Design an enzyme around this catalytic site. Structure first.
Site, PDB file in Angstrom:
ATOM      1  CG  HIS A  73     -12.162  52.292  -0.453  1.00 21.37           C
ATOM      2  ND1 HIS A  73     -11.025  53.057  -0.603  1.00 21.37           N
ATOM      3  CD2 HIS A  73     -12.863  52.415  -1.599  1.00 21.37           C
ATOM      4  CE1 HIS A  73     -11.045  53.642  -1.777  1.00 21.37           C
ATOM      5  NE2 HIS A  73     -12.166  53.264  -2.414  1.00 21.37           N
TER       6      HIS A  73
ATOM      7  CG  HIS B  45     -14.871  58.204  -2.806  1.00 22.78           C
ATOM      8  ND1 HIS B  45     -14.461  57.002  -2.307  1.00 22.78           N
ATOM      9  CD2 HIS B  45     -14.494  58.225  -4.098  1.00 22.78           C
ATOM     10  CE1 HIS B  45     -13.861  56.310  -3.256  1.00 22.78           C
ATOM     11  NE2 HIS B  45     -13.860  57.040  -4.359  1.00 22.78           N
TER      12      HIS B  45
ATOM     13  CB  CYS C 258     -11.872  54.901  -5.819  1.00 18.46           C
ATOM     14  SG  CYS C 258     -13.136  55.564  -6.949  1.00 18.46           S
TER      15      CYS C 258
END
EC number: 2.3.1.86
Lengths: 774, 96, 145, 128, 163
Positions: free
Chosen positions: A574, A615, A337
């Site tokens: 994030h 995401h 990620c």
């Protein structure tokens, strides 16, 4: 008084047409940019060692960067937004020609072929646009009919009584025998030549059932997005994984946003062997995996080479086969990620090592059934049924730094930046959107939890505090400027003494060969005099704090440009919307600011872009990097609109603010970007307002640049509108910039550059401009 | 009409004023600077009330810093915000 | 607790005050959805004074099953999943507009209205009383407006 | 020739795609407005330059506004009409023709109820 | 109607059409194998590999010769023989698409009853049916009858015969 007194009393109205701007950075007059930077910065920085972001693009659940920024910062589309999103989503198509007799030019509806005015796009489509954009219910169509409400899986049974005999070919019956052994009976039918197969009691058999899976919502690329719309042919579409389309479209879009319409124009300034593809993924073509693993198992028709299309680095390959045809560095990272952030860092180093002068960096990752399932088993994705029980509509299921956050909304797509050497960016006169002040990654500690977020990246603020009695003069830029003046004096002396020495050697040389010898040695002395100046500039301007433990890499990066630690206005978290990550991030930032000695009451403003986009895994850090750059250039900080109620645990973090609505600042000077991947992948990247750069160059250079950009922005804007109407933004190179014969000649020569061939018109390598004395 | 609408899981909480104060001050500051609010706007008093009502230590430190670092020589609007701030700091410290 | 405080009603302006005054409010909405919560979110950001808590719940006052549930949810303990609160004031402004309905047109809609604006108001007071008595509370009376 | 290449700016060759809206509007007046008689040589050429200015308005306005050239009578003083329009939309001084506005221009160049324009705007199959 | 063995100029044309995931008409008969698939040399050597299993012997550089005069070079050694590859692809087509109750056997005798087409015609009708795979499990027998009917009319068009 007739209708003539009232037709001359009637006024003609003017209706606004979309004029979709590329939004290059606004270049101030040299006098104004010289005030914001300290005056001592001029000729202090080596501009080869400064990395600038010179063009960015993305393919995301809100279409392009421009529409995603529109929706992130203003929460609605303007005319230009609605047209671009209507054109992306294939609601409207351009049409020049005759329509029902009369000659029409402009938009039409894609289905009906009705002419559509620009004013009428928002009325006609902005419902459907917003209804099939962003985070919404998984649309089977988009994912090979995958319906998460009815998820197919097959279960073995041991047949308790023999089956009716069914006909099959000989080879098929043979393969049934080899599988089942004695548990099956195959008997050739004489006349036909086909067999009759009969599974006997005790034989295996596989029955399809359904499972009702609970993760029903996802950040999907808008319904009606289609790679042909950009101008990718069907042959490419058929061959490659859908991810490869995203990347390809993101890369051409980034290049256009850099003003570079023809990628070969790079090779007018650099050697083919310096144009880097430092951009990675999380799981690469998972569609192609799901082919080879599960579609092959059922023996479905699948392309024979589906393996090659599934590798992480295949996407970097296809871009470099179809668009770039370089022999530059290709470092494809994998960082779950935080890949996008790792790809910047690699890139940055790949330019600072000198192996390259331009990387294509960024991340990209698809969303597929396999993935969405495994993340739901891991319990990382938010359970959509639970959200529905809490009265959460899909839009509002990704809500970072919130009390009630449970897990992240998965999404798909790609983001691509183009980073360069500042020096080379000024020389090409491409637009500069940011300065990459630092990029770093870290691992946390020993531990038995792979998905554990951790505080390794803290080590970007590492510095010593046991001897802070007196101010370190090594931060006092004026001192540094003095020391650079001290060195360039020694350089002066050295160049004189070397020119003497040359003259002395060349006197004994015979007169005929004198010219050749002097030319060759005068180049090498010019080379060394450069090398020494850039080494000084690198020692004092850029790398002043590498060998000093009393300066943190985070402080160091800002201090390069005269900025204090207080200047870091914005941190782009994030902010996945998961209970551990958002707290771990905040603590880490908060602890970095607290250690370094951020002034009390000067928090970083938190940007949680993933509330809108969701995401995209690999590409997350490449979207936050785009969301930064556009902030840094607008001074507008978008609110996390899904931050309904900031988590009471985050109050303890004094140096962090959690806005819920757009703050239109007077300026943003720097932006942090932090990502924490699975497996202790921790990344950070500091981007600074490009204006600081212009402090480091003379008025004449600046103005020459400004001219070249202004030209390259017009030529981009032309190419962008011509590509968009006729679906030819993507144009795959048919041939490399060199014939097959010259390949060897082009690779070997460091100074080979492409020149316009008058016959063709396109940029190619000329045999005259290879190993050429000139 | 007599459908059950109520559920406990659909209950939404808003309690995190501590943050919202700092956002609501920072929106004022930049509105004053961009001259969206003048010196004749009852909105400037409304906002000043709604900030004071959320006075704490962290908010006073967050104002003190932002107002003290205002460059009054950049414009008129900067002199306006710097005066208003200084006063609103003195207010919040009194009503804490 | 205040009901019938959706955007652009008197309730809305009361709520702005109560939150401005540092009150702990439960506002009930009969049109619950994303737009409505986001509106209430904005109201609390702007106005919501220190100490002030806002709890937006979906509610259909015209149901007794919702009226008994709401009060059960407010009064019940934080362990059980309730708010652990005790109402100091009720403002049951919930209502539905009836227009051009003379004597002879009294039907379903009118009957329902009456049940929101009178009968279920009584059941709300009734329910609170029952909760207060049950927990042994006699020096904290719930002002009904 | 008597029909010159239209996409010329001060005497260097260009294309309709690499000329600003200003450049195009000046070049039209220059080729279609006779200084000596202080008149448009053909009323259809005036109408042409009036449509082109209305197209510039439309492209560079943000919201619905009135037309600055209410009647094409105002074009009889072309330098005042151009100055006026490009003062209102000064972004159209520095921005090359939107690909759609090129096609719209070339589409007006084939209007059959107007005088054939005294230039060659583009090299294609209808060059002859 | 009288049988006629199928021509190499149909077998090599359907094979290339199928493998390149293309329509039968979209292939120009006079164009080199290396020209159709120029970029991806992998699908080129898969064409070669199939043509090898189809008609055994292959000339020297069949990739620089158009399919047109490569069909007549292959026609020399071929005589109505489907081969293992084309038989395997036809078997593949029926099992995946045609519904339960419609196997090759009954499909062959449906071509014999409806149209009168014998073996050498039937195996040419099943070839143009493979050229245009329905890519969807045939819903019912009736739909599949219309499917074969329509791709017997395309067989009648390409050969030049009445039904």
């Amino acid at each position: 008084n007739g209708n003539s007194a009232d037709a001359a009393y009637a006024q003609v109205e003017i209706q606004p047409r979309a004029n979709i701007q590329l939004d290059f950075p606004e270049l101030k007059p040299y006098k104004q940019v010289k005030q914001i930077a300290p005056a001592e910065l001029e000729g202090l920085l080596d501009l080869e060692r400064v990395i600038v972001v010179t063009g960015f693009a993305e393919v995301g659940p809100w279409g392009s960067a421009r529409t995603r920024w529109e929706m992130e910062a203003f929460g609605e589309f303007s005319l230009e937004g609605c047209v671009e999103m209507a054109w992306i989503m294939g609601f409207i198509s351009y049409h020049n020609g005759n329509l029902k007799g009369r000659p029409y030019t402009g938009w039409v509806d894609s289905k009906t072929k009705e002419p559509v005015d620009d004013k009428d796009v928002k009325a006609k489509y902005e419902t459907s646009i917003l209804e099939h954009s962003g985070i919404r219910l998984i649309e089977p169509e988009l994912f090979n009919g995958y319906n998460p409400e009815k998820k197919e899986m097959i279960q073995e049974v041991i047949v308790e009584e023999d089956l009716e005999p069914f006909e099959a070919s000989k080879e098929t019956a043979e393969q049934f025998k080899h599988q089942h052994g004695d548990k099956v009976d195959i008997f050739e039918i004489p006349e036909t030549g086909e067999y009759s197969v009969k599974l006997l009691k005790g034989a295996t058999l596989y029955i399809p059932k359904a499972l009702r899976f609970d993760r029903l919502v996802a950040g999907q690329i808008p319904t009606g997005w289609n790679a042909k719309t950009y101008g990718i042919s069907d042959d490419i579409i058929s061959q490659v994984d859908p991810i490869t389309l995203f990347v390809l479209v993101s890369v051409v879009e980034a290049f256009i946003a850099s003003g570079i319409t023809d990628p070969y124009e790079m090779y007018k300034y650099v050697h083919v062997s310096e144009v880097g593809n430092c951009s990675g993924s999380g799981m690469g073509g998972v569609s192609a995996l799901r082919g080879m693993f599960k579609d092959r198992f059922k023996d479905e028709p699948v392309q024979n080479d589906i393996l090659q299309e599934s590798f992480i680095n295949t996407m970097s390959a296809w871009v470099n086969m179809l668009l770039i045809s370089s022999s530059g560095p290709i470092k494809t990272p994998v960082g779950a990620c935080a890949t996008s952030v790792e790809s910047v860092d690699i890139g940055v180093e790949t330019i600072l090592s000198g192996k390259a002068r331009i990387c294509i960096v960024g991340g990209y990752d698809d969303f597929q059934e396999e993935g969405s399932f495994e993340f739901g088993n891991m319990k990382a994705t938010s359970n959509t049924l639970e959200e529905f029980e809490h009265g959460r509509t899909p839009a509002e299921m990704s809500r970072p730094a919130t009390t009630t956050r449970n897990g992240f909304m998965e999404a798909q797509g790609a983001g691509i930046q183009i980073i360069m050497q500042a020096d080379l960016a000024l020389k090409m006169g491409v637009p500069i959107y940011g300065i990459v002040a630092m990029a770093a990654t870290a691992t946390d500690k020993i531990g038995r939890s792979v998905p554990a977020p951790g505080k390794g990246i803290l080590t970007t603020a590492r510095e010593h505090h046991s001897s802070v009695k007196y101010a370190s003069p090594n931060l006092n830029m004026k001192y540094r400027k003095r020391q650079l003046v001290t060195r360039e004096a020694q350089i002066k002396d050295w160049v004189e003494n070397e020119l003497e020495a040359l003259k002395l050697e060349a006197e004994e040389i015979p007169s005929e060969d004198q010219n050749e010898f002097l030319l060759e040695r005068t180049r090498e002395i010019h080379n060394e005099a450069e090398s020494q100046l850039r080494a000084a500039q690198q020692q004092w301007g850029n790398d002043f704090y590498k060998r000093d433990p009393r300066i943190a890499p985070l402080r160091g990066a800002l201090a390069t440009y005269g900025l204090t630690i207080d200047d870091l206005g914005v941190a782009s978290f994030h902010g996945t919307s998961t209970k551990a990550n958002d707290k771990n991030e905040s603590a880490t930032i908060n602890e970095m600011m607290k250690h370094l000695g951020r002034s009390e009451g000067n928090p970083v403003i938190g940007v949680f872009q993933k509330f809108l986009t969701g995401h995209p895994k690999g590409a997350a850090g490449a979207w936050m990097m785009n969301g930064a750059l556009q902030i840094l250039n607008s001074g507008i900080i978008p609110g996390n609109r899904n931050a309904d109620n900031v988590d009471k645990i985050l109050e303890q973090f004094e140096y962090v603010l959690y806005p819920s609505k757009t703050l239109k600042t007077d300026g943003v000077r720097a932006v942090s970007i932090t990502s924490f991947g699975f497996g202790q992948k921790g990344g950070q990247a500091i981007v600074v307002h490009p204006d600081y750069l212009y402090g480091a160059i003379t008025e004449d250079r600046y103005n020459e640049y400004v001219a070249k950009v202004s030209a390259r922005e017009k030529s981009a804007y032309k190419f962008f509108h011509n590509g968009m109407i006729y679906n030819k933004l993507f144009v795959s190179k048919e041939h490399a910039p060199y014939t097959d014969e010259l390949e060897e000649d082009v690779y070997l020569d460091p100074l080979a550059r492409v020149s316009k061939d008058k016959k063709s018109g396109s940029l190619t390598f000329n045999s005259k401009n290879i190993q050429s004395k000139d | 009409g007599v459908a059950t609408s109520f559920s406990r899981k659909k209950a939404r909480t808003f309690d995190s004023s501590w943050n919202w104060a700092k956002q609501s001050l920072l929106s004022l500051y930049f509105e004053i600077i961009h001259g969206v609010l003048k010196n004749v706007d009852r909105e400037v008093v409304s906002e000043a009330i709604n900030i004071m009502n959320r006075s704490n230590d962290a908010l006073i430190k967050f104002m003190e810093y932002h107002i003290s670092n205002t460059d009054e020589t950049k414009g008129e609007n900067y002199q306006l915000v710097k005066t208003l701030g200084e006063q609103l700091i003195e207010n919040c410290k009194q009503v804490l | 607790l205040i009901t019938g405080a959706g955007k652009g009603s008197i309730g809305a302006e009361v709520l702005q005050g109560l939150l401005q005054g540092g009150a702990k409010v439960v506002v009930t909405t009969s049109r619950f959805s994303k737009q409505v919560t986001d509106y209430y979110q904005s109201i609390y950001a702007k106005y919501g004074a220190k100490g002030s808590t806002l709890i937006v719940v979906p509610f259909n006052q015209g149901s007794k099953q919702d009226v008994e549930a709401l009060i059960e949810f407010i009064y019940d303990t934080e362990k059980n999943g309730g708010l652990g609160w005790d109402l100091d004031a009720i403002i049951p402004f919930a209502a539905i507009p009836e227009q051009g309905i003379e004597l002879e047109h009294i039907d379903s809609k009118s009957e329902f209205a009456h049940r929101i604006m009178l009968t279920n108001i009584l059941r709300m007071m009734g329910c609170v009383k029952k909760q207060k008595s049950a927990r042994g509370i006699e020096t904290r009376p719930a002002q009904v407006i | 020739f008597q029909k010159p290449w239209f996409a010329t700016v001060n005497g260097q060759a260009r294309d309709l795609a690499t000329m600003t809206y200003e450049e195009v509007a000046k070049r039209l007046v220059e080729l279609m407005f006779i200084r000596s008689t202080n008149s448009w040589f053909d009323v259809t050429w005036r109408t042409f330059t009036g449509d082109f200015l209305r197209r510039v308005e439309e492209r560079f306005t943000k919201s619905k506004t009135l037309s600055l050239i209410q009647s094409y009578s105002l074009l009889d003083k072309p330098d005042e009409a151009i100055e006026k329009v490009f003062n209102a939309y000064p972004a159209a001084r520095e921005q090359f023709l939107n690909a759609q506005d090129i096609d719209h221009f070339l589409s007006m160049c084939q209007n059959p109820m107007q005088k054939p324009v005294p230039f060659v705007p583009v090299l294609d199959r209808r060059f002859e | 109607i009288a049988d006629e063995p199928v021509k190499a100029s149909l077998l090599l044309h359907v094979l290339v059409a199928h493998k390149l995931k293309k329509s039968l008409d979209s292939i120009p008969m006079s164009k080199t194998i290396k020209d159709l698939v120029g970029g991806k040399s992998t699908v080129q050597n898969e064409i070669l590999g199939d043509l090898g299993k189809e008609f055994g012997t292959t000339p020297e550089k069949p990739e620089e010769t158009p399919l047109e005069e490569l069909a007549e070079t292959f026609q020399d050694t071929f005589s109505g023989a489907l081969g293992k590859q084309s038989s395997s692809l036809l078997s593949r087509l029926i099992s995946s698409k045609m519904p339960g109750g419609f196997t090759i056997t009954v499909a062959r005798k449906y071509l014999q009853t409806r149209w009168g087409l014998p073996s050498g015609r039937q195996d040419g009708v099943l070839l143009v049916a493979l050229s245009n795979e329905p890519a969807a499990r045939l819903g019912s027998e009736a739909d599949a009858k219309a499917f074969l009917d329509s791709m017997a009319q395309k067989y009648a068009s390409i050969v030049g015969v009445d039904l």
